[PDB]
Amino acid sequence: XXXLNFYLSYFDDVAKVLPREHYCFIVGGWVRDRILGEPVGYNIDVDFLTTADPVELAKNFAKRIGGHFFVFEPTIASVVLHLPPYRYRFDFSPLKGKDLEKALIEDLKERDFTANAIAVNLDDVLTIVYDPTGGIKDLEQGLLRPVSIENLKRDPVRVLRGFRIAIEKNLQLTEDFYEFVKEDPRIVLKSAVERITHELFKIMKEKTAHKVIRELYEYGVLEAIIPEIGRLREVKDPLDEHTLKTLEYLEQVIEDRAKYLSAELLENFGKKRVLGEFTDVELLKWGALFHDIGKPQTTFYEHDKVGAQIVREIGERLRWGDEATEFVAKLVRHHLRPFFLREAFKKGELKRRGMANFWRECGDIAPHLFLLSIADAMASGDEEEDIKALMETIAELESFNRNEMKXXXXXXXXXXXXXXXXXXXXXXXXXXXXXX
RNA sequence: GGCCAGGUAGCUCAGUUGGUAGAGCACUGGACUGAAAAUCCAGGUGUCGGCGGUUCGAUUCCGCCCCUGGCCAC
């Protein structure tokens, strides 16, 4: 054990439920988050270790705060409270033993990292902390240290969390972690697939993510999870450096998306929800990772379609959404289109036909496609003239869409009259002529 | 409570832009057979999980539910 800021309102609701003879402990992330003094976000996650009945506790607590109560999995209980601006999650876990303190420490020693192993008493919050793993000492040094490499081997998905949190909380992972990763990167494959997928996305969520992705490529964890990435190396132009730099540039372009896309294209950008907590932005970055996955398979003619099917296979395997992998695949197939239309514009051969076709085929990925094309044009070292030509091409497409665009009898006649419309009796006579 | 994948004949499974339904085991009858095996030919009354919505037309598109399975601490 080592010795106001730790306060959360709903902790009161924990005290008005929890019995007089039972004790409660605040454990894990929320402590670390607060020790770092990091801003409490709109998403709040708190973890508890209680000596009372987790089911009863969570039930009455949930009835108090007006959230939904549920249990899963050493069964752990949870309460979820969700309204549009803020979302709370409280995980309640059982703590049993003859000795309280010994049991608490016993639990804390099993956790993934030092900073996560810190715990406090709920009553002292409403300040003596428990960190047998010496978390705080590492937090002062800006270090993220696994409690044991055995703990990381027991639950290999933690190996991914290390990469995430270190970037997310801006900490430096210690040496034994990287050493152990170097040993067997493949270890992550021991835990469940959906957890790896979820962590991968959670990494793709933050804007420094390209650094972590590079770390996963160099340490070969990414290859272990996504084998098709390793096949970017066998072809020399450096393709892997090209794609990773394409990703970094895509994040830069994403931050600059306001000055590139028009207002109507920026309107709904980022609003598509995938896997519940993630947006089409993550899908954009994933699209940047896979933007050329087809070059090793095939000058490379068909590599975009091949890319699409490969991405589809990956989405199938890694248990993404159907709509998520569909979106990313569609993003990959069309990845070279703005360059083609750019080539049509530079020679002045681009007209209403090609624009109409472009907005017909894919209008949904248009902003994503534009940003991605810009990023790729940056990573390939295109001359400034070419870049500006591309951005003016994009300008022309948006300019075209914004203003300049304004048994079977039903099936063919309706479609034909709708196509011809894109004057009742006249059109009727036209349909009558269309019949013969 | 959240995400993901499935729901189609008794069992078990296909079906990328909307039309009228498909296989195999199994089951019934029949044929070659002293007999049978096994093989060939014929037989599917399916509220395409459920109720609405757009369409003349929904297994397919959209919306809301039901059921089964997989995941959900740090």
UniProtKB/Swiss-Prot annotation:
Cofactors: Mg(2+)
Domain topic, free-text comment: Adopts a seahorse-like shape and consists of four domains: head, neck, body, and tail.
Protein's name according to its UniProt entry: CC-adding tRNA nucleotidyltransferase
Sample GO molecular function, one term: CC tRNA cytidylyltransferase activity
Effect of residue 335 to A: Does not affect CMP incorporation
Catalysed reactions listed for this entry: a tRNA precursor + 2 CTP = a tRNA with a 3' CC end + 2 diphosphate
Described purpose of this protein according to its UniProt entry: tRNA nucleotidyltransferase involved in the synthesis of the tRNA CCA terminus. Adds the two cytidine residues to tRNA.
UniProt entry keywords in alphabetical sequence: Magnesium, Metal-binding, Nucleotide-binding, Nucleotidyltransferase, RNA-binding, Transferase, tRNA processing, tRNA-binding
Effect of residue 155 to A: Does not affect CMP incorporation
Domain of life (superkingdom): Bacteria
Listed EC numbers: 2.7.7.-
From-to range in the entire protein, with total length: 17 to 448 of 512
Family: Belongs to the tRNA nucleotidyltransferase/poly(A) polymerase family.
